[PDB]
From Swiss-Prot, chains A, B, C, D, E, F, G, H:
It comes from Ovis aries. One of its GO terms (cellular component) is apical plasma membrane. Aquaporins contain two tandem repeats each containing three membrane-spanning domains and a pore-forming loop with the signature motif Asn-Pro-Ala (NPA). It is a multi-pass membrane protein. The chain holds residues 6 to 225 of 263 of the full protein. One of its GO terms (molecular function) is calmodulin binding. The gene is MIP. This is Lens fiber major intrinsic protein.
């Protein structure tokens, strides 16, 4: 039916805004801003706003790893999962392209390219991105679990704060690229794929491990 | 009936406090405070507090763009929409006037005048203000959507965090003036209208686009 | 009955912790920490935690102005209102006294004494403290209003964020002393009452005005 | 039955992530970062994410003091309480061990070892850790109280913000070690037990006092 | 003879570099950099380097006020004094024009336009600029006094540190525009002459007063 | 003769500028500026500029302790020493009075009143002020020693950097009030003499001890 | 004779230390340190110390551009100029290699690789590096001019402060690479030559232009 | 004769003040102060002031490594070299003991104990301390070289800025302990000798190597 493509657009538009507002706040307007907390809250609130906006439509995955987790969790058709990933990657590039146009080149920089910290190895970078996306996916699956008897608040505020947690930790390590689409968007628009498989392997394994940890070790 | 004017006052008073507390926390008491996160949370929590206060009465729009979005969304009578905008603009000036009286001139400054960043063009400024207000309006419409089956937390905390998101991003670009009333209040009390149409055109288009994106591409 | 004194203790203990954790985080461990956001969130989260703790018992006023507002709002017996204020003031001094013991004198300072900013007059200080406590009381009355049909999140998170809003704004002006008990506690333990009536007149008027604004102009 | 060991793992895994993400964000990547707010939110959001993840399974204590409080509160079998503490301590070391592997030695440091502030005595350190854990446990017991008639938001966001409150205050005093497992993890992996009993005595008394204060002085 | 025009160029080139390096380091590459000390040393070291470079040729006045002081001090022919001022103003605009070309517009800003601080009146601004230039001229006249029996170090390091002193103080008040040429250069290239007479009246009076204070009250 | 009063004015004017520029840069235009280095260099460069200006005339003592040291060192007539102290104190008040007029009240504050740090006792404050002024006087006496065979640079740059050294250390302890005139000027114009004898006893003993240490233990 | 190779070593060793201490202090031990002033003084004081050390031997050029300027200024044999450049480049790599060994990889980074600022074009980068090296060379030639009748202080402190001036300005633009050897050292040891001709063309032209400007337009 | 013991005291007193003012400014009054530049200038200006004070008497070595260098350089009797080292170590402890008394325990800390950076090995720490003291000694030997034909400024300002250079670089690595006496003073008064041989081996080798590099490879 047509609720399929309304979700494909919801993924495309939300991922566009997610990258636009996320990467945009990750742009350094200062040589030293101490911007880790500021940037971490930006991604989290961007996710929280979008989940509140397009959660009922597409689930507001805006993340190939998150879509991969639901694909592993047997809650998404494969075709739709592919369609989300291509829409998220298309949305990510579109958001970063619009961000490129509206942002002066002096502060545009690398468009917040997820890059490994000098002393962080690709293996260490992979493990960190696995844990960054594992807890994040684990938080998503619990919040999106239909059986949620206990009465709590907003699932948007939860998964957003989980994303902020990952950035409060992982930004120093890998730039906190727990979103392959977010990492892809400046990689393509800057022509820089250095250690870019890390931001695909890491989140996908962490999404995969987080999915399996939830629906079999936590709630079969 | 009389629930009309109780809402007109609720808009007037809340917009007064919104500008008073928002602009007040946006006043620089330091040459470098790194105040972006501090100011962004101020507006968001100011909106969240006021939405919790006068949401049931007027909807706590405190924003001509937000009122324009509901006017476009066929949820507001035009006369009442005009009455909200004149009350919000009157409230904005009143709040900034009170802020002027209570704040020493050495820190009063331009009363936090929304001004374009040196390298940001009026077209780039317009687009940013469109996106700042689009997601914000989109978050408002989803939170204020009567059909909200999924059980979440506070709509006040949501739309406030959406406003913080816009300031975390747009303050560097345009001062994050996603509120024509907020931009109008120091423009009139400082006699400075430089690029002030940007803070009317941008938010209104973004409010208009955000409204149309919601009730036809997201939920007809 | 005995639910009276369980609330008197709840006020005493919560105000003790409110001052202890609030004033404690307001103590400067740095010559320049840029601590406004850090201190503002401390008070707000301290209030949010305590409201979650002793809200069902006493209402977690921990504020003579807040108790005065409910006394004006015809929701509190006068005797109990007096009993709350004496307990809050006793709790405030007790919390600041314990804070004095556990904190080294080099960082103890004035025990975070609410003091007027150099250029802020007592009249300007009074008006700011009125508005700081008006919105705060207004947010409390709306959150504590039994008729709260619209389904939202936590009232603790709301009134706490309202308190953070007041500190994000008023700390520069008056130290954000929207709590007479909080202002009283270091005033007595430092032997400094300079402009201390401001932190009683301001909040009480703001609490009074906020109460009247709610139950007659907002919801008769 | 088997819901026992699913909770033992939930405690082990969540405490692993709690230490991993908590201690990891507490690692200084800067000589002066002014990281108190950043680190305080990290622990709180880490707790909030994990409580949302494994709250329904084990209660997400991830804290020997918190388990001790429920043991005192007659809501936990002793054997299970021991099993939680050994799992939390095992999880804490495992999380800090993984953090050690993924973090470069130049920023690894003491692995965020809870250490007394220069002027803070062991008695003052103990009292602070008692109050840090008292309010935290008090907030947990109220949020986890089955009788919670008043409709509020998320218990995860509450207890997480309570943890942030303790770090906003106690980090200057003792590093805010209101978790014996969190304090144990770098103590064992750095071979440093200086004043380490403080981080066991303090939280346990504060957990004990917080438990007794709740279910007899606040709600028998 | 031809040592005249070699000095006219020395004034032109040094004032070009003085504005180029001075204004360039005064450009804000950060929203809060706490750049006062950094900018103050930039002007001072720029003056010290240029005085070391072209001091023996023209005296390295690079300042219409400084030339005016020597004109008042009966050590400069009037024609040459005019020729220095036109060369300094031409050099200032040339330096700021080159700075405009090499600097991205996002950080170009107002080209470090000397602007009155919000609470500083034109009379207060004038007095500050008088004192900023008085001590600076007084330091120049003493260092350039042929009778300097006492054996000291570099006159370049002295007058440069005097300029840094003026910026350490006057930047907060008026931007420390103790150089009419330096103030003129961005005023003309930004089309902004707001309170620009202050940066001519102030320094000239301060240069005049500083000259008279030296050669009649200090050393007739 | 008349070289006496030319020195009395030189002391009066230089102490006026010393307080004006010193106290002025010590005024906090930010809640946290991390201004210790900035303020320390301000006093030092202010002293260096003035020593270069009026050193040959009066010696540029601009300090009652420094005059007292030369009085003890048998290099100053007592009457002239009194005349310097009254001129320095008159100059100090005049400089702080002019600073009061030109500075907005919001940043005027206590006019940089030398105040004991919270944990610093009057005895500890006295000892620190003794050492701050001892080395400073010792540096002055060596630089002003006629027998200075070894060829070095500027005595102004030396004694100024000695003053910066004292402020880099003593500002945290006592505000680095190694000048009774500098401490007197805001004490009289703010009506605050709290622990003000410390800033007279300390520097005078340190000046006295520094004088005796030089001309008998270092160079009889 | 043998004073040739003593100078070749002096160039080699001083350039080794110049890169070692310069690049070492340019290494970011913080995500935001606001290190521009700190790094700028490091290079300048490193140059000042080395000029004081090996100035009498080789002239302490430690800069291929500086050697090129003297080669253009007809004060250096070509063979010796080549020998200085190869020694400086060998010293630069040796210094950066030792710095690599002693510095942990987490803070080693790109070894302070001179890289163009995002919005700075190669032409703008070239012009800035020309001016950075022009004034620096101009300051060197004046300080090293045998005819220096006027009695001033240290030539080491002068040329060092000139280098600090260039870094206070050029670090934002190009990293202030006014030394081809300094730019070469991390370029070779990181395998990154992006826009590396800029740091050769710019300084050499600026050194060439600075040399010609001095000995023909300033002092034939 | 008696000029021996006047120098022994000069070493004792100057090293006392050197440690007192150096370690005192190295005490952290803030969790993040970004104090590297502030502390680096403190040591350098402390050395510069003392060299100006007691340079003509003892040479103002205030450093066992510096005394060892002159002992190696055949410019000091061995007995006197021992007498300097015991006086410097006695002075260092005395200065740190006085600093202990006058400084509150909350900011006293480890008394600025030279401690290896987490990722810095003892071998890397040794090499850095060798280079920190090599250039410093090399700068001392050149400045103190009787044959100093070229006319420059102050040797005190030179060796002080060399010390600042070492702290601008080495503070991150080892705390910049290029003075065994400075490292010894808090090691003994805190009962902590962890990696304390590094601060003896490193500086002594660097002093030894710096001495030999000067008087045989630079000036036989
Ligand atoms: C749907 C239709 C929307 C129409 C919107 C029209 C906007 C046109 C914007 C054109 C902007 C151009 C500028 O950014 C800028 C001028 O260049 P300069 O900086 O003056 O020089 C060049 C130098 N260099 C080195 C890059 C070659 N152009 C660029 O460089 C990059 C342009 C990036 C365009 C990104 C297009 C994003 C498309 C978003 C599609 C959203 C679809 C939504 C469907 C419902
Ligand atoms: C409803 C009745 C409320 C009554 C409240 C009475 C307050 C009176 C406040 C008067 C304040 C004056 C000061 O701020 C200040 C003294 O001036 P100076 O700084 O000494 O010098 C001057 C220099 N210059 C250059 C500006 C000419 N005045 C000003 O400059 C600006 C005054 C701004 C007044 C703003 C009035 C806001 C009205 C808010 C209405 C709220 C209505 C609510 C209805 C339910
Ligand atoms: C209920 C029973 C609780 C028992 C708890 C026993 C704690 C004893 C603490 C005694 C602490 C002493 C230290 O702080 C300290 C040592 O002094 P120094 O710093 O070494 O020198 C002195 C210098 N000067 C200038 C101040 C004179 N004393 C002080 O100065 C200030 C002490 C402040 C005591 C505050 C008592 C708070 C009572 C809280 C009551 C809570 C009741 C709860 C009922 C359920
Ligand atoms: C379950 C199976 C998981 C398999 C994962 C395999 C990961 C192997 C990681 C090995 C890592 C080694 C590096 O960190 C590092 C290389 O050393 P260097 O820095 O090159 O030199 C050495 C110098 N010094 C002084 C320390 C001797 N090793 C270390 O030093 C410390 C290693 C710490 C290992 C921590 C193991 C955590 C186990 C987590 C278990 C989770 C179980 C989950 C069950 C479901
Ligand atoms: C002597 C001969 C020297 C020749 C040097 C040739 C350099 C040519 C530089 C041309 C540079 C152009 C760019 O900056 C830039 C491109 O523009 P955009 O940013 O792409 O767009 C435009 C937008 N808008 C709104 C401004 C219209 N142009 C500008 O906007 C401003 C140019 C400023 C030129 C300043 C010339 C300084 C002359 C210095 C003279 C020194 C003489 C020394 C004699 C010995
Ligand atoms: C020459 C004669 C000079 C006489 C000067 C007299 C000064 C007496 C100072 C006594 C100071 C005591 C305080 O610091 C302080 C009180 O203690 P609390 O903090 O209240 O408690 C204790 C707790 N605890 C854990 C440490 C046991 N005492 C200390 O702890 C440490 C004292 C350190 C004394 C350092 C003496 C330096 C001697 C310098 C000699 C200079 C000689 C010059 C010859 C020409």
């Amino acid at each position: 039916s047509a609720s399929f493509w309304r979700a494909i657009f919801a993924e495309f538009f939300a991922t566009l805004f997610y990258v636009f507002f996320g990467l945009g706040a990750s742009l350094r307007w200062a040589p030293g801003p101490l911007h880790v907390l500021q940037v971490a809250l930006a991604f989290g609130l961007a996710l929280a706003t979008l989940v509140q906006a397009v959660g009922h439509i597409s689930g507001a995955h805006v993340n190939p790893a998150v879509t991969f987790a639901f694909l592993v969790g047997s809650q998404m058709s494969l075709l739709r999962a592919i369609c989300y990933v291509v829409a998220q990657l298309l949305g990510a590039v579109a958001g970063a392209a619009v961000l490129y146009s509206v942002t002066p080149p002096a502060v545009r920089g690398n468009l917040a390219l997820n890059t490994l910290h000098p002393g962080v190895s690709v293996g260490q970078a992979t493990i960190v991105e696995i844990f960054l996306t594992l807890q994040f996916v684990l938080c998503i699956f619990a919040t999106y679990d239909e059986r949620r008897n206990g009465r709590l608040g907003s699932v948007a505020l939860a998964v957003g704060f989980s994303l902020t947690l990952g950035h409060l930790f992982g930004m120093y390590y890998t730039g906190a690229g727990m979103n392959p689409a977010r990492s892809f968007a400046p990689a393509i628009l800057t022509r820089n794929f250095t250690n870019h498989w890390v931001y695909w392997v890491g989140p996908v394994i962490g999404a995969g491990l987080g999915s399996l940890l939830y629906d079999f070790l936590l709630f079969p």
